[PDB]
Design a protein around this ligand. Structure first.
Ligand SMILES: [Zn+2]
Length: 194
């Protein structure tokens, strides 16, 4: 006789949500929420939080490491609406996009703003810089990125978690973290000179 579906009892006991960052060393992991628009208006499917890890073989025609970004980019053509309609996508991944994955996406976007991505990410850590190309490209080209800070954090739960008032709490680190993502997102776009 199971208790509640509110994920927490097993993940809590098993370990300590040590769940490292995306693309750890076993398999991807991320949440994504999208909605389909019907004509000049919006529609909300019957789904809260959902996603899928690892991809399957398409037999003679496999795709590359599609990240959350391309993930929805791939769902929209899944419902196969019409044109007069629209798509308001929302991605939830403590991790932001990538130099390339961002491009792929940005295109689909820049090429057709008809899409609206609202990415809510927590923090990213890389040692590139010049590759940021896509980053500022899919971000400006039409993807709305947001740095999920303390407030947006407890909120991130309040978004998909079966408790608009989950018991999660902020740690005296969000500072360094936020700074990193923010200072960056800012930078990459604000092309912070030398
Ligand atoms: Zn990627």
């Amino acid at each position: 006789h199971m208790l509640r579906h509110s994920m927490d009892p097993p993940t809590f006991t098993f370990n300590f949500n040590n769940e490292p960052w995306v693309r750890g060393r076993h398999e991807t992991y991320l949440c994504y929420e999208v909605e389909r628009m019907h004509n000049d208006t919006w529609v909300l499917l019957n789904q809260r939080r959902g996603f899928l890890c690892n991809q399957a073989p398409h037999k003679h025609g496999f795709l590359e490491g599609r990240h959350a970004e391309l993930c929805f980019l791939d769902v929209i053509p899944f419902w196969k609406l019409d044109l007069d309609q629209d798509y308001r996508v929302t991605c939830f991944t403590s991790w932001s996009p990538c130099f390339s994955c961002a491009q792929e996406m940005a295109k689909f976007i820049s090429k057709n703003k008809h899409v609206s991505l609202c990415i809510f990410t927590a923090r990213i850590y890389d040692d590139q810089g010049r590759c940021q190309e896509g980053l500022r490209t899919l971000a400006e080209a039409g993807a709305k990125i947001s740095i999920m800070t303390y407030s947006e954090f407890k909120h991130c739960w309040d978004t998909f978690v079966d408790h608009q008032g989950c018991p999660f709490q902020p740690w005296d680190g969000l500072d360094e973290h936020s700074q990193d993502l923010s200072g960056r997102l800012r930078a990459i776009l604000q092309n912070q000179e030398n």
